């Protein structure tokens, strides 16, 4: 029962196909639910449970916020281009923020900013200061600190408003967050150069956390297994694969161990 809400902001100075000038995506537990970009300029849903939101002004209020954010980031890109003494060109401004609600009821919050794909400035919300990565970022560290307003405000947002919406979201998203979808496993083999390569693929499991293991007679072959990263399906489920190079002789000694919440016991899978 832990849960997270996170918003991801991307602002670029030169857009390209697929990359609007400004984009904001809201994620509930790593699944998307709201979208806004600078070409349609309206907030729109990305998950059907957002229709349960009872606040009438929700979509119009959040649209205006997003329209604020794109105006301000255009200005931020310009400020940072002068500060770092850069030419006009392709440039990137990014921001992540949100809150977590842990199992015991405690909460965490974050607000991180990045320029040109490197860290820039990040909120330390429990000392109300910012960490700066740069001398350029220290100029911002000083402005927000000497004015002394912004860290206290975001801290209030993260610890309060953000957590109130998360509880509401978690309740609306109950069916989708709690579902369990079993992985569908297939094991494949390939002998090349008197070396047999065994491949395990888990298709369509939900939720995201999974452990996939290659076992020689029930023993983990940890430093011999090469596994992929957890990758998303188009329906909100996940995918993962793990391969193992073996001697063609030892062949029925190998089992793929899939460990996931959908299975009461880890699934054992042979070729």
């Amino acid at each position: 029962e832990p849960h997270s809400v996170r918003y991801f902001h991307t602002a670029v100075s030169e857009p390209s196909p697929g990359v609007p000038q400004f984009v904001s995506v809201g994620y509930l537990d790593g699944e998307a639910f709201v979208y806004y970009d600078s070409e349609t300029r309206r907030k729109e849903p990305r998950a059907d449970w957002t229709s349960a939101i009872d606040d009438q002004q929700y979509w119009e209020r959040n649209t205006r916020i997003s329209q604020n954010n794109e105006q301000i980031y255009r200005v931020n890109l310009e400020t940072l281009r002068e500060r770092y003494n850069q030419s006009r060109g392709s440039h990137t401004w990014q921001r992540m923020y949100g809150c977590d609600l842990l199992e015991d009821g405690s909460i965490r919050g974050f607000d991180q900013y990045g320029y040109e794909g490197r860290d820039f400035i990040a909120l330390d919300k429990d000392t109300r200061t910012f960490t700066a990565a740069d001398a350029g970022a220290q100029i911002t560290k000083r402005k927000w600190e000497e004015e002394g307003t912004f860290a206290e405000t975001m801290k209030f947002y993260l610890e309060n408003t953000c957590i109130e919406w998360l509880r509401k979201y978690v309740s609306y998203g109950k069916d989708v967050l709690e579902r369990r979808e079993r992985p569908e496993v297939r094991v494949s083999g390939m002998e090349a150069d008197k070396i047999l390569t065994l491949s395990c693929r888990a298709h369509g499991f939900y939720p995201r956390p999974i452990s996939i293991s290659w076992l020689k007679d029930g023993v983990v072959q940890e430093q011999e297994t090469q596994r992929g990263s957890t990758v998303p399906n188009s329906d909100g489920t996940y995918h993962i694969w793990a391969t193992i190079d073996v001697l063609p002789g030892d062949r029925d000694k190998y089992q793929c161990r899939v460990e996931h919440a959908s299975l009461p016991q880890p699934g054992l899978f042979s070729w």
Binding site: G26, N62, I72, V75, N76, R95, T140, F150, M154, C162
Partner: peptide, 9 residues
């Protein structure tokens, strides 16, 4: 819901 306060560098 997103934060109302703006982030001016």
């Amino acid at each position: 819901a997103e934060a109302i306060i703006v982030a001016m560098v």
